[PDB]
């Protein structure tokens, strides 16, 4: 991206919740463009969040994303010799990309043999504030604020 | 080593084929090898006539062939005695039974193939290459043409190091797909070696 400021592709809302954020998450689950299996998994999961949890799936989901969005992250940088890890805010845009990505990743890191479940259970755990997803998130912030000395290299 | 043949590039437009006849699968390869046999002799013979093109139309066992020349005389013959020898030497090659028309070239000074051969020859006779070239561009440029250009290969003057000579005037847009640029190549066997000759002539446009 040397020229323009590459605008963000706008996604078509969910075919059930009409929520764009959902499509996004579904796209992060998808692999080899098998978007059906991807959509299914997320919906089967939403129905697993309905059973084992008396709450509306959609709200559990958004809640999750929320706890998994890092607000500070460390970015490397060469400053006089060594490569000091400068701590800095995270764009609203990047927060999402990371949150969703992390969820799917940690979700596929779980044990339960069923794809749709790993997502179901991961989302919930995330909502409660536990789970591999939120780990990474809190690990990131920890990383920054632990290198908050080189923060005068603001960037 | 770039750039396409200016003709083959424009075949869709500003330039028709040298053999326009339908055919297919079982015939095409046979019906084409022939055309080459044809052209083969004509160029081997009608050299002094000043060959420039050999259109070859067809329909069935009644071929066309319309040799284009600068000196239609040399072709025909005395009263038309040679156009008898060839026209016959023709069927001794293709039982097919074919004609043999002859159109004259209106100013061989706008026939890339001719201008080329023109230069190719001089070079064989040992004329100063650069001169022969400049002259040629002039002739061509001096008798119509909105642009022209000639190129001689290498070993100019028999020099041990192969070179490459130029010469050009007026627009000669090889890129413009609609120019109508006549392309002509001439060889040039020599005591020291082959030296290709390229002639480019630009006419009108649309």
């Amino acid at each position: 991206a040397r020229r323009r400021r590459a605008e963000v592709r706008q996604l078509q809302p969910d075919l059930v919740y009409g929520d764009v954020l959902v499509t996004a998450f579904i796209n992060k689950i998808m692999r080899d463009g098998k978007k059906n299996l991807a959509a299914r998994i997320f919906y089967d999961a939403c129905k697993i969040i309905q059973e084992k949890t008396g709450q509306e799936p959609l709200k559990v989901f958004k809640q999750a994303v929320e706890n998994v969005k890092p607000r500070m992250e460390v970015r490397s940088r060469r400053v006089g010799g060594a490569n000091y890890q400068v701590p800095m805010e995270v764009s609203p845009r990047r927060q999402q990309s990371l949150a969703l990505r992390w969820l799917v990743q940690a979700a596929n890191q779980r044990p339960e043999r069923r794809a749709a479940v790993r997502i179901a259970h991961e989302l919930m755990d995330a909502a409660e504030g536990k789970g591999g997803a939120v780990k990474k998130k809190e690990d990131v912030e920890r990383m920054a604020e632990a290198n908050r000395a080189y923060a005068h290299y603001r960037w | 080593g770039n750039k396409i043949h200016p003709i083959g590039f424009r075949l869709g437009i500003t330039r028709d084929w040298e053999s326009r006849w339908y055919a297919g699968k079982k015939q095409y390869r046979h019906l084409l090898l022939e055309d080459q046999r044809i052209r083969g002799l004509l160029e081997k013979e009608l050299y002094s006539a000043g060959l420039a093109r050999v259109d070859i139309e067809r329909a069935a066992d009644n071929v066309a062939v319309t040799v284009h020349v600068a000196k239609p005389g040399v072709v025909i013959g005395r009263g038309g005695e040679r156009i008898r020898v060839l026209r016959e030497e023709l069927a001794k090659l293709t039982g097919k039974n074919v004609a043999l028309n002859v159109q004259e070239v209106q100013n061989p000074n706008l026939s890339a193939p001719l201008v080329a051969q023109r230069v190719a020859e001089q070079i064989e006779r040992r004329f100063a290459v650069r001169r022969a070239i400049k002259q040629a561009v002039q002739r061509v440029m001096e008798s119509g043409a909105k642009g022209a250009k000639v190129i001689v290969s290498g070993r100019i003057g028999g020099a041990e190091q192969a070179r490459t000579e130029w010469a050009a005037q007026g627009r000669v847009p090889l890129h413009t797909l609609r120019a109508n640029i006549d392309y002509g190549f001439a060889l040039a066997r020599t005591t020291y070696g082959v030296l290709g000759v390229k002639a480019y002539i630009f006419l009108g446009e649309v």
């Binding site: - | 396409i4 043949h5 339908y22 699968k25």
Partner: protein, 60 residues
């Protein structure tokens, strides 16, 4: 592509499996197209001249 090795025209395959295309212009046995009798090179050379009836340049 030695005259000597253009015994391909000899028919006499003794067995028809010993038969082989060969260029009908340069002898370029290596990549001779059927529909033309010509090798990948000559096919390209002639297509440029226009001596290949209705054989324009592709593009799409």
């Amino acid at each position: 592509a030695r005259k000597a090795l253009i015994e391909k025209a000899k028919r006499t395959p003794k067995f028809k499996v010993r038969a082989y295309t060969r260029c009908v212009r340069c002898g370029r046995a290596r990549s001779v197209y059927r529909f033309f009798g010509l090798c990948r090179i000559c096919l390209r050379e002639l297509a440029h001249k226009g001596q290949l009836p209705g054989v324009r340049k592709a593009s799409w």
